[PDB]
Amino acid sequence: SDLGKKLLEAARAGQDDEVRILMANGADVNAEDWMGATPLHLAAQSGHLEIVEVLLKTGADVNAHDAFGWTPLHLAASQGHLEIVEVLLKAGADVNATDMVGRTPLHLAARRGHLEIVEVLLKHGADVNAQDKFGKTPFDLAIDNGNEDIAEVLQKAAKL
Ligand SMILES: [Cl-]
């Protein structure tokens, strides 16, 4: 609980050595804060790859959802952290997991303009036709945000 609180913020801040000490001293790797974020969520969101790999190696739940439904893959796709996206997928992250608004990681990558992430999620079986609670596909979010290259790629993937 107490070390868990410290682990969350050391993961967010990229404090590799502190993460390691906290885990060796028994910090709960799946500790949650007020919004259900776990250390893996915060490391994946803030782009700290080594810490993501350490947490995965010592039992972090790769498919944990926070209070908003976001999984660590949602957060890394949204924030554009490609290597972390790949490690999470390799650790078994659900490529088509959905959040509170029905969005998948591909929705968020398209909304945020992250073409490399879009291309990698597609090659790992992301659902181009998934519809969020607003009735929007990833293609719709690419158009809404003026991301024409992502939109063209998503079109080609839907066609074939
Ligand atoms: Cl684009």
Author numbering: 2 to 161
Study text:
We characterized these binders both biochemically and biophysically and determined the three-dimensional structure of one DARPin-mTFP1 complex. The two DARPins we report here bind specifically and with high affinity to mTFP1.
The complex with DARPin 1238_G01 did not crystallize, but the structure of both isolated DARPins was determined as well (1238_G01, 1.6 Å resolution, R/Rfree of 16/18) and (1238_E11, 2.1 Å resolution, R/Rfree of 17/21). For DARPins 1238_E11, a high affinity with an equilibrium dissociation constant (KD) value of 3 nM was determined, while the affinity of 1238_G01 was found to be lower with a value of ∼88 nM. Anti-mTFP1 DARPin 1238_E11 and DARPin 1238_G01 differ in 13 out of 21 selected library residues, suggesting alternative binding epitopes, in line with the ELISA experiments.
